[PDB]
Amino acid sequence: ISLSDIENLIQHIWEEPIFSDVTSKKVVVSLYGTLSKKIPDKFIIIEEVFPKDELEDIWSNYEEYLDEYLIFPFLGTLGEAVICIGYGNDNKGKIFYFDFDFGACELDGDNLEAFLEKLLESGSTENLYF
């Protein structure tokens, strides 16, 4: 794997304000049809942006589980699920959900910008519909 290439894919996540903002936001699972059929969660609470200076150690722990999906984890969540980014030719830059209970799921072809734009504040009272 090219960690430099991984950094180029996710570098915007370390910039402010989004670096500090994103860990108070959440993914609206019902926006993603396949994900909504795969997991029970209605929202995925984002908890940690994995820091650049730890990616090598984090990948040394995750590589055996994720290298066949060609997705790289960069956000931690309230549980063990991780938000990942594709680095293969088919999935490059596409955002994925992964956990060890239900597996991997592409977020409908959204890239990083599209994924971030659709997040809600965790405390949002926005009315959501069926």
């Binding site: 029970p40 209605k42 609470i45 722990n61 589980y65 309230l78 549980g79 699920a81 060890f100 209970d101």
Partner: protein, 127 residues
Amino acid sequence: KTVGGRKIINSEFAGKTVTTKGGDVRFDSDGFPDFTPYSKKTVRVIGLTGDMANDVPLAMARAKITKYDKSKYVWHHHQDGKTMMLIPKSVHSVRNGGVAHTGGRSVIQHNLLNPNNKLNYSSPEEL
């Protein structure tokens, strides 16, 4: 050793002990880790779904706490589908040097699909 038709993660260590950054973790005969030596709160909850954001507030209420150190701990769904456990990330979370595993979120969902043949695992004592 499957749940929902998926291989239980690291089930090849069933009945064995694995090392993690936070200490040794024994895997039971079904392939599930035993986190009881590490849990700071082990609480029975009715109505768990496997939805983390829905289930954590229920566990917190039964644990009689309103906050926990998210940099240090993570809530674990026991395979009984009835218990939540507050576990150090150093044993629970791959990102922190813990051991990858399958938990009760899968079992709850498996049981919804298999109502006449549920996986019924025994519960740890509350703490």
